[PDB]
Amino acid sequence: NGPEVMSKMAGESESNLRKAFEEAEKNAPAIIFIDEIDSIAPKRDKTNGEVERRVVSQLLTLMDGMKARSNVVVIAATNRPNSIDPALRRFGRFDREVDIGIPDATGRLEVLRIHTKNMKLADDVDLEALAAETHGYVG
Amino acid sequence: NGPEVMSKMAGESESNLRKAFEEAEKNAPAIIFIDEIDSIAPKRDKTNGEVERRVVSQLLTLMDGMKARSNVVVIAATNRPNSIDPALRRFGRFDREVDIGIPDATGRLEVLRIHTKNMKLADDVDLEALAAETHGYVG
Amino acid sequence: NGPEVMSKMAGESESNLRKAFEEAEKNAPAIIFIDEIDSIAPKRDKTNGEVERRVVSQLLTLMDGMKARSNVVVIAATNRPNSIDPALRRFGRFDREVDIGDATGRLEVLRIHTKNMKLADDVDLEALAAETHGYVG
Amino acid sequence: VGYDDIGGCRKQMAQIREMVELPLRHPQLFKAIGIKPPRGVLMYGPPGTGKTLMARAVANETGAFFFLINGPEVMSKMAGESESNLRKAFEEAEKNAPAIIFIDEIDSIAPKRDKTNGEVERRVVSQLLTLMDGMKARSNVVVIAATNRPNSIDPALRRFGRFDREVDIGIPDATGRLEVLRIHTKNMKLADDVDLEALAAETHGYVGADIASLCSEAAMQQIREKMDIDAEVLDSLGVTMDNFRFALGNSNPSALRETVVESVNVTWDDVGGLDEIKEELKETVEYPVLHPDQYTKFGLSPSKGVLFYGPPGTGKTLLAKAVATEVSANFISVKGPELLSMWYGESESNIRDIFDKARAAAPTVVFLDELDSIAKARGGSLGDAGGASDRVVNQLLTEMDGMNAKKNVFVIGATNRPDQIDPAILRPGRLDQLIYVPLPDENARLSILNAQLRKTPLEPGLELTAIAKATQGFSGAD
Amino acid sequence: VGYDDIGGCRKQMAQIREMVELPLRHPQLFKAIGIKPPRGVLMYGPPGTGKTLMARAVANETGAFFFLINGPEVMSKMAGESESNLRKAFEEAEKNAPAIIFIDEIDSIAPKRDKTNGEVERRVVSQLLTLMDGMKARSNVVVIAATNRPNSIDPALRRFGRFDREVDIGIPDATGRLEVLRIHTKNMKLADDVDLEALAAETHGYVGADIASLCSEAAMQQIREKMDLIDLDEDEIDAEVLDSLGVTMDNFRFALGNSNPSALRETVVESVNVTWDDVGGLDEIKEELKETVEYPVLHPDQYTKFGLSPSKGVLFYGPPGTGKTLLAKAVATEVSANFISVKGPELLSMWYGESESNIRDIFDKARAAAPTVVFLDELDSIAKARGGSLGDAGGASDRVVNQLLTEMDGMNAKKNVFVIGATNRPDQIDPAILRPGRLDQLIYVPLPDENARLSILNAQLRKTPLEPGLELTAIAKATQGFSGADLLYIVQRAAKYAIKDSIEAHRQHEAEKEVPEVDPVPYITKEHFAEAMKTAKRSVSDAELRRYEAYSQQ
Amino acid sequence: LSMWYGESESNIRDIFDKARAAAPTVVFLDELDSIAKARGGSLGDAGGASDRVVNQLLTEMDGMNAKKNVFVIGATNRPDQIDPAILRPGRLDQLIYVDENARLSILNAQLRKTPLEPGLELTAIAKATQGFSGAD
Amino acid sequence: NGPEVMSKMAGESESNLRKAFEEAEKNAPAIIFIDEIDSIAPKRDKTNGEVERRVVSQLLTLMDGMKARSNVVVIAATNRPNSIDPALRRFGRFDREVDIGDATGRLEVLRIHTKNMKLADDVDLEALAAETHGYVG
Amino acid sequence: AAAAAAAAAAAAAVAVAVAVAAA
Ligand SMILES: [Mg+2]
Ligand SMILES: [Mg+2]
Ligand SMILES: [Mg+2]
Ligand SMILES: [Mg+2]
């Protein structure tokens, strides 16, 4: 989780990241999912603190430095990528940015079908018309 | 309460929320009540300071993330929802925004009747007429 | 005091307000006088600082909520009462507003301020109460 | 890794290799000359350029001891333990053999010591200063540092004795990208059709890792073309040139990944009329970027700026879209009033950042829509916000013409009120050619009508000459 | 290291020698005069000036014990043992002999009491206060403290009786640079073809260590040519190239063109080289500029004989596209003084205080690498009128202008800081900058005359192959109201037409080859000028010209 | 002078507040004409600012009693364009009118700390320069 | 002095102020010298700490709590006359300030300092006291 | 044994406003 890693003591958040990555590399070919990464990856130029900048540098060196990573893949999720350090948006660290955007009519139909497969519907309900009349729903 | 979770040190407010939610989930299905959510959920990108962004992100992760919640219910109270982070006003975090607004004549009559249940009145007292003159008085 | 309790450290002024209210509720039923509340009540819309809105929310939490107050009355003081939150000027928090803004009162203040000293025998307070027409007290 | 991996920076490879090897292979020669060699160097440049790659290569090739320090790794929780770690590291490096220290991301451990407000960091930087210079400073050891923001280092640390020589590992050139491509395509199997020279020519801003990403994406495209496991398909993959074209048409340089424009699809045949203006734009954009030898033969820099002005809807934004879509140079589409901010100085900070990206990923084209919104006259506004607009226009003036390099920035402005522009912008050097875009004539209106009707079925007998003769004062929008 | 190593500041060296030897060598004169000699001495100045070198040299000539205390090395691991460590070090230093104690990096233990927020640092500083106070007259031990920046000192440490005498180890003059050069170059095989006077006359802002950098760089360059010629191949070593080694002068020129002062690299400017022949026209104006810039930096004796204080600022004003930035470029590259480029709005920042801190830092570097020439381009961006409107947006601009005035008015003959101004609209320039005594002389750059314009054209087409039988006077007479930028535009369009002709000719040649000289003529033809004249304009309208003329008249 | 409103009067107001605070004092108003301009009629924003400045100056100078003993000194080159409302009695009534010998004395006071050549007389420059001034 | 009132112990500064005030009230009708008040009073608006506010409130409540039978006065020296709390300059604590904007005292200081040395036989310290104008201490 | 601690409190910015004149 995003803010879950940092602690009050000086030099312990980076220790937590070290422990996480070392466990991931020591155990198996693993997947690291970092949720809400915008809270631990600002641009290091607009921020003024010290622990946040140091944590960001720790992440940069841990994901891509000397003997960077062995068969471990990193997934990140965010609601705004523009507030992220450009040094993290590069091949080797975050290879590609997928845009999970607003579903269209077909997507809304698929969402309705999946979400209404476990309930007892009536016989008079069709889902295509409902997916047509629902327009700006994000899923 | 709003300011009661924050602390001086960097990375402790989120610890406060983590332990609070853990205590809530430790024993029984629980109800959480966060009074004045607008004081600890500002609109991200409109605020200067990493601590507010971090606490907002931590709240988002706690309420809706991997293995989000189990038979726990969350309630918030605010006076200006428009100042809340939009990511918080989604289904799965704050799905039903109930509007507790100004009562009508019947509602205010009910308010008078409940308030004057412990008070000693005179024989020549009615509350319907009294309710009629008051127009904007709420609670 | 108003500008005394406000600080730049995050989560410190709210801690000072909570400590003051706990000290007021710990010993005895007491009277709290928070002076110059207009500096720490920026109406939550005209301000830009987060700490001011945070201490405003702390004040509304300490004044109203679950087991908010147990036999303790708070008193405020300001010069312009319009730059306060409408949620702060509500019933249960500041339900009575007293306007403390003449010649007989000025003469009473002159009499109570000249009480511990024998000034003279031929001093008339009428001219002292009529010439100082713009003295606040 | 070796010296055949790092590509595109011959000067920096030679400088670092000599500095690290020659004083550790022929010390007697340096005793003969008399002076000691430089012993501390800071590699700096945009990310993904090869700083860490160079450090890895040096560690692999040189047979001396090598000690690696990531930035935050030194700090610890107990009081005065970080300095103990630094002292222990230096002692371990010195005691065993002549050694090379490498400090990755020095910005984390070497602040400016003037804007910081902490305590432990200021003692860690002071301890670093004492270890690098003072009584018993260092013997038979060399220090390499890597950074992305050399300006975030205290100047006291960057003096002779600590870090005397500064190597600048910057963006490559066309030859550098060709060499990097040749390095990165030395292990995969390629079809004969691939031509890396053209690909390097069209990669206008890619730096280092960008090329690697391009190659990976092309390979993945090839993998998902012949997967619709036997050795028949395991063999004979054959990454075609079409794969590379697709990956190049999909990827963009990481520098501009922040400001990637939405993919709008227009073409030159979509622009009816204005043939001579279209050819002029082609001539002014493609000649400096493809034919620099002739410009250096005449010894003159190229023309850069241009300003369209005319009635609304004559096709200014349409020309801008055509440039964005059908030109090899990178495109930065910037809004007029988007760059303003409520804070003090953030407008000019954003403008400087935008132009820094443009000059970084050169050759680049920047489109200033409605130039009269941010660049108006100076001092006309009596009641202002502190002259913020005045400072914005002054920032534009200095950024478009100042102590810059004039490498490749093409500014196109589009405004329909050319009287409200500051005359200091209209002079040659910033926006040197002003192209009027008049209302179409009959032969242009017919061309426009065909341009927008090229995907529409029509009755065979429908002639558009009557419509053209019938519209007289109309515009493209009409 | 010895008295012959530290160089430049002879008087300061004599003062420190007296201060450190007399209370340890001869205390009879101190008793005779009746003053107790001090126990602590500070030396400050820019980093890399010779402070630690001087302290080590002092520790060398005098046989007294020399106990160096690295600033950041005084803490400890166990709870409350650093105090005991410092105490035992100090007591051993006192008990052993009348020693000499050197405390390095005092700034690490002097955070001004405001940005500390700790308790161990407070304990350690207070312990140091007690130890410094507890120094009996019989100890005969003195402490030398080394600070990089003088304003980050605890005044409690600065109070009289603990640390009273500071010494500003400043920038050595030309003689100091020459002597330090001799000190560094005396232990080397120097070829005969060397003139250290020229190196110590062309180097201006260098202080202490960058001179060593210069020497090392020159040695490296020599290694470059001798390695290229020798070609050892990295498989053995020879024994003839070393003895056939001589340091040249061109390597010194290369090192001078390569390196810059260690202080100003933070503000290193990208190398753009324009000669005085690039600024066509403006002959008298360039002569006046040369006279104004060369005299304060080269003739101090003449300055004294004149007895009149030279102006320490100047403002260029005129219409756009006349060459103000061009003259700034020319001065920056070939004026023989340091130069720091700054853009007006660049310094401003949204935080509180940072803006003024930026002005203070830029001028601190300017004073450090004295002499220098600070170029303020587009001066109307930061220096506008004060109190123009009630909506001052916090008065930050007013505060910035006040900081510029208060921190720029503290000038004198020393520090030789020359301010170059350059604005497009002089009407918005604050009169405070224009009052006499601050920026007096004003230079107006007019539109070029026909001869001046011909010179401009020749200066812009200097490095351009051109026809033999072609003249430019016709163009000059025709472009009567044009400006330098307009001349650049016309020549650029002519070049663009020429490259078009070249490329179409090459394409036709390639086509006919499909079914040597590169172009029909490598030189720009008269026809290119003839048909590139249809698209030029005049940069400045008559209204702007009239406004500038009125400003000149007033 | 402030191009806005109020501020340009508040500057003179707090200048006279500093004057009455540091009693006794001398307020040397250089170039009085530029400030006063004989408010008269101008009919514009500059005219309104000039009228407000003149009214502020009159109402902050005429309110000086025998206490606080301030003293305003004005100087000008053109006395034609000064306001007769400021040359009135009761506010500012004195009129000090301000040659070759003064020019020679000014040149000798300007050439005090200067190593002059001994064989040089300034009486020729004093006789040649008639309508000059100390600045020139 | 100013910054000699603080210590590692939290609140020790208020105890030191109370100890000094009770010692000056206990011993005799006397005078207290508080040198460098600009460190103790940070003007209360630009500061952000809490022990500075606590020591300012302690000095305020100790200067206000002096009765008629105390008969003690306080003297305070400062360098700049602008970075002082108006609550410290309020009526009751500090109202009578002097504006010190001589040759005999300079000759006295010279005869105090230089009287412990084998000086000379042809010295006139009156000329050094006359020619020295702005020196102090 | 002793220990250290990190702290990051806050920051303060300055805004810019627009005014309206009446000629
Ligand atoms: Mg790297
Ligand atoms: Mg448009
Ligand atoms: Mg040193
Ligand atoms: Mg210019």
Q: Scan for tokens 């409605």, then name that residue.
A: D370
SS3 E18: helix
Per-residue b/e over E319-338, b at no fewer than 16 CB within 10 Å? bbbbbbbbbbbbbbbebebb
HSE-CB at B69 with a 13 A cutoff on CA atoms is 21
Element (H, E) at C77: strand C73-77
Asked if G39 contacts G52 with a C-beta cutoff of 8 angstroms, the reply is no
Name the resolution in angstroms: 3.2
User: Which tokens in the block code for residue E168?
Assistant: 């500003």
How far CA A78 is from CA of A75, E32, E56, E328, in Å, comes to 10, 79, 56, 48
Asked if D51 contacts D43 with a C-beta cutoff of 8 angstroms, the reply is yes
Query: Residue E273 class from Cβ within 10 Å (0-12 exposed, 13-18 middle, 19+ buried)?
Result: exposed
Shortest alpha-carbon distance between residue H18 and chain E (Å): 7
Identify the CA nearest to D261 among candidates D349, D321, D338, D350: D321
Q: Tell me, what amino acid is at B18?
A: R
Cα gap E484→E491, rounded to integer Å: 11
Q: Scan for tokens 């020669």, then name that residue.
A: D29
Secondary-structure breakdown of chain A: helix, strand, coil percentages, each rounded to the nearest 5: 40, 5, 55
Tell how far CA E39 is from the center of its chain.
36
Pairing assessment for the beta strands D330-334 and D306-309 based on DSSP bridges: unpaired
Q: Which residues of H touch C10 (CB under 8 A)?
A: 9-10
Are A3 and B50 an interchain contact pair (Cβ–Cβ within 8 Å)?
no
∠ CA E105-E111-E114, nearest 5°, is 175
Cβ pairs D/H, distance under 8 A: 34
Q: Which residues contact E426 (CB under 8 A, 6 or more apart)?
A: E315, E317, E380, E551
G3, G8, G117: residue with CB nearest E33 = G117
Q: Which ligand is nearest to the CA of E49?
A: 3
Cα gap D170→D51, rounded to integer Å: 10
Q: Which residues contact D280 (CB under 8 A, 6 or more apart)?
A: D435
SS3 E350: coil
Q: Scan for tokens 């309110």, then name that residue.
A: F63
Helices then strands, each counted (H, E), chain A:
4, 2
Q: Is A79 annotated as a binding residue?
A: yes
Cα gap E411→E417, rounded to integer Å: 8
Instruction: Name beta bridge partners: F28.
Output: F73
Q: Is A136 on the interface with B (CB under 8 A)?
A: no
Beta strands in chain A (DSSP E): 31-35, 73-77
Shortest alpha-carbon distance between residue C4 and chain G (Å): 7
Between chain F and chain A, are at least 3 CB pairs below 8 A?
A: no
Q: What is the DSSP letter of C106?
A: H
Rg, Å, chain B Cα set:
21
Experimental determination approach used: cryo-EM
Are A35 and B10 an interchain contact pair (Cβ–Cβ within 8 Å)?
no
Asked if A125 contacts A106 with a C-beta cutoff of 8 angstroms, the reply is no
HEC secondary structure over chain D: CCCCCCCCCHHHHHHHHHHHHHHHCCHHHHHHHCCCCCCEEEEECCCCCCHHHHHHHHHHHCCCEEEEEECHHHCCCCCCCHHHHHHHHHHHHHHHCCEEEEEECHHHCCCCCCCCCCCHHHHHHHHHHHHHCCCCCCCCEEEEEEECCHHHCCHHHHCCCCCCEEEECCCCCHHHHHHHHHHHCCCCCECCCCCHHHHHHHCCCCCCHHHHHHHHHHHHHHHCCCCCCCHHHHCCCCECHHHHHHHHHHCCCHHHHHHCCCCCCCCHHHCCCCHHHHHHHHHHHHHHHHCHHHHHHHCCCCCCCEEEECCCCCCHHHHHHHHHHCCCCEEEEECCHHHCCCECCHHHHHHHHHHHHHHHCCCEEEEEECHHHHCCCCCCCCCCCCCHHHHHHHHHHHHHCCCCCCCCEEEEEECCCCCCCCHHHHCCCCCCCEEECCCCCHHHHHHHHHHHCCCCCCCCCCCCHHHHHHCCCCCCCC
Q: Scan for tokens 């993330």, then name that residue.
A: B65
Q: Which residues of H touch A8 (CB under 8 A)?
A: 5-6
Identify the CA nearest to E312 among candidates E371, E263, E225, E264: E371
Cα gap D449→D447, rounded to integer Å: 5
Instruction: Name beta bridge partners: F70.
Output: F25
User: Which tokens in the block code for residue D343?
Assistant: 């804070």
User: Which tokens in the block code for residue D469?
Assistant: 């003769």
Cα gap G77→G38, rounded to integer Å: 9
Are H15 and C10 an interchain contact pair (Cβ–Cβ within 8 Å)?
no
Cα gap E493→E532, rounded to integer Å: 6
Query: Residue D224 class from Cβ within 10 Å (0-12 exposed, 13-18 middle, 19+ buried)?
Result: exposed
Tell how far CA C133 is from the center of its chain.
26
DSSP assignment of G81-131, as one string? SSSS-TTTSSTTT---------HHHHHHHHHHHGGGS---SS--HHHHHHH
Tell how far CA E219 is from the center of its chain.
25
Identify the CA nearest to B114 among candidates B95, B127, B104: B127
Asked if C74 contacts C25 with a C-beta cutoff of 8 angstroms, the reply is no
Q: Which residues contact D203 (CB under 8 A, 6 or more apart)?
A: D177, D181, D210, D211, D214, D248
User: Which tokens in the block code for residue C29?
Assistant: 């039923």
Through-space distance between the first and last CA atoms of chain D, rounded to whole angstroms: 63
Q: Scan for tokens 């954009």, then name that residue.
A: D285
Q: Ligand 3 mean position to E53 CA, how many Å?
A: 7
Listed as own residue / partner, the contacts of B131-139 with beta carbons closer than 8 Å and 24 or more positions apart are: B131/B105, B132/B105, B134/B108, B136/B102, B137/B108, B138/B102, B138/B103, B139/B103, B139/B111
Q: What is the DSSP letter of B70?
A: S
Asked if E140 contacts E38 with a C-beta cutoff of 8 angstroms, the reply is no
Through-space distance between the first and last CA atoms of chain C, rounded to whole angstroms: 21
Query: Residue G102 class from Cβ within 10 Å (0-12 exposed, 13-18 middle, 19+ buried)?
Result: exposed
HEC secondary structure over chain F: CCCCCCHHHHHHHHHHHHHHHCCCEEEEEECHHHHHCCCCCCCCHHHHHHHHHHHHHHHHHCCCCCCCCEEEEEECCCCCCCCCCCCCCCCCCCCCCCCHHHHHHHHHHHCCCCCCCCCCCCHHHHHHCCCCCCCC
Ligand 2 is a single-atom ion; what residues have CB below 5 A from it? Answer: D 317
Q: Which residues contact E263 (CB under 8 A, 6 or more apart)?
A: D155, E46, E205, E207, E365, E368, E369
User: Which tokens in the block code for residue D218?
Assistant: 């092309």
Cα gap A103→A117, rounded to integer Å: 19
Measured between CA atoms, the residue of chain H closest to residue B12 is H7
Cα gap E19→E139, rounded to integer Å: 16
Identify the CA nearest to A49 among candidates B70, B9, C44, E47: B9
SS3 E504: helix
Listed as own residue / partner, the contacts of D292-297 with beta carbons closer than 8 Å and 24 or more positions apart are: D294/E499, D294/E502, D294/E503, D295/E495, D295/E499, D297/E465, D297/E522
Other Cβ atoms less than 10 A from the Cβ of E166: the count is 16
User: Which tokens in the block code for residue E227?
Assistant: 């390695």
Q: Which ligand is nearest to the CA of E55?
A: 3
HEC secondary structure over E244-275: CCCCCCHHHHHHHHHCCCCCHHHHCCCCCCCC
Longest dimension (CA), chain H: 71
SS3 B16: helix
Rg, Å, chain G Cα set:
20
Measured between CA atoms, the residue of chain F closest to residue E389 is F4
Are G50 and C12 an interchain contact pair (Cβ–Cβ within 8 Å)?
yes
Query: Residue E316 class from Cβ within 10 Å (0-12 exposed, 13-18 middle, 19+ buried)?
Result: buried
Asked if E50 contacts D102 with a C-beta cutoff of 8 angstroms, the reply is no
Q: What is the DSSP letter of E237?
A: -
Asked if D126 contacts D109 with a C-beta cutoff of 8 angstroms, the reply is no
Asked if E516 contacts E469 with a C-beta cutoff of 8 angstroms, the reply is no
Identify the CA nearest to A86 among candidates D102, H11, D344, D49: D49
Q: Tell me, what amino acid is at C117?
A: M
**Chain B interface, mutation test: which of A5, A36, A43, A53, most B Cβ atoms within 10 Å?**
A36
Q: Ligand 4 mean position to D382 CA, how many Å?
A: 26
Q: Which residues contact D293 (CB under 8 A, 6 or more apart)?
A: none
Are E388 and F6 an interchain contact pair (Cβ–Cβ within 8 Å)?
no
Q: Ligand 3 mean position to E147 CA, how many Å?
A: 9
SS3 B7: coil
Identify the CA nearest to D324 among candidates D247, D400, D243, D412: D412
Identify the CA nearest to E462 among candidates E198, E302, E276, E327: E276
Cα gap A59→A43, rounded to integer Å: 13
Cβ pairs C/G, distance under 8 A: 13
Instruction: Name beta bridge partners: C76.
Output: C34
Q: Is C8 on the interface with B (CB under 8 A)?
A: no
Measured between CA atoms, the residue of chain G closest to residue E160 is G137
Identify the CA nearest to D98 among candidates D138, D38, D40, D146: D138
Q: Is B46 on the interface with A (CB under 8 A)?
A: no
Cα gap E322→E5, rounded to integer Å: 51
HSE-CB at D441 with a 13 A cutoff on CA atoms is 3
Identify the CA nearest to D424 among candidates E318, B131, G39: E318
Q: Which residues of H touch A49 (CB under 8 A)?
A: 8
Cα gap E240→A61, rounded to integer Å: 47
Measured between CA atoms, the residue of chain G closest to residue C9 is G48
How far CA C29 is from CA of C19, D73, E56, E514, in Å, comes to 16, 55, 70, 106
Q: Which residues of H touch E391 (CB under 8 A)?
A: 17-19
Asked if D69 contacts D101 with a C-beta cutoff of 8 angstroms, the reply is yes
User: Which tokens in the block code for residue C7?
Assistant: 């600080």
Identify the CA nearest to D337 among candidates D307, D370, D313: D370
Q: Tell me, what amino acid is at E527?
A: E
Q: Tell me, what amino acid is at B55?
A: V
Are H19 and E389 an interchain contact pair (Cβ–Cβ within 8 Å)?
yes
Cα gap D426→D434, rounded to integer Å: 8
Q: Which residues of B touch A51 (CB under 8 A)?
A: 10-11
Q: Which ligand is nearest to the CA of D416?
A: 2
∠ CA C108-C113-C115, nearest 5°, is 95
Q: Which ligand is nearest to the CA of D157?
A: 3
Q: Which residues contact D426 (CB under 8 A, 6 or more apart)?
A: D307, D434, E539
Cα gap H4→D95, rounded to integer Å: 30
Are F7 and E387 an interchain contact pair (Cβ–Cβ within 8 Å)?
yes
Measured between CA atoms, the residue of chain C closest to residue H14 is C48
Longest dimension (CA), chain F: 61
Are G3 and E33 an interchain contact pair (Cβ–Cβ within 8 Å)?
no
Shortest alpha-carbon distance between residue E369 and chain D (Å): 14
Cα gap D285→D319, rounded to integer Å: 13
Cα gap B49→B42, rounded to integer Å: 11
Cα gap E540→D426, rounded to integer Å: 9
Other Cβ atoms less than 10 A from the Cβ of A122: the count is 5
G8, G116, G118: residue with CB nearest E122 = G8
Annotated binding-site positions of C for ATP: 79, 113
Element (H, E) at B35: strand B30-35
Tell how far CA E438 is from the center of its chain.
22
Longest dimension (CA), chain E: 108
User: Is the dihedral angle over the CA atoms A84, A87, A93, A97 positive or is it negative?
Assistant: positive
User: Which tokens in the block code for residue D138?
Assistant: 């260092």
Annotated binding-site positions of B: 79, 115
B7, B8, B39: residue with CB nearest C54 = B39
